[PDB]
Nucleic acid binder design. Structure first.
Length: 88
RNA sequence: ACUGAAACUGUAGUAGAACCAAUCGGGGUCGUCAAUA
């Protein structure tokens, strides 16, 4: 059988357009949405921070509400029961 | 003379080891005070 495409198109999730409009021009705030999280491996013997395993990861602040546009290109003959299966 | 499809930048990793908020100190004890006329 030929490979089936998806019925569902899912966009990227972006911040609310008014919130992104507020960030325009504010490079300092644009960086401030994220902060450094440290990570370090500990030596299982000596119990000490294993140097050059010290690590900083950028993480984005919790509370973000992001939204993606979804398109369901369902088959036009699809049974109403099968619609409920997909929705389910 | 006709949009490829489909695919999680994820997986493992303790911001930690070491460092005394501490050193010294009797809750004690005796000579005046004042400057003019």
């Amino acid at each position: 059988p030929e490979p089936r495409p998806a019925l569902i198109a899912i966009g990227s999730a972006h911040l609310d357009p008014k919130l992104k409009a507020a960030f325009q021009g504010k490079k300092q705030l644009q960086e401030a949405i994220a902060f450094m999280k440290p990570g370090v491996a500990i030596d299982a013997i000596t119990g000490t921070a294993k140097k050059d395993f010290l690590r900083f990861e950028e993480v984005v602040r919790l509370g973000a509400k992001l939204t993606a546009e979804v398109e369901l290109n369902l088959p036009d003959n699809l049974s109403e029961t099968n619609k409920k299966v997909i929705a389910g």
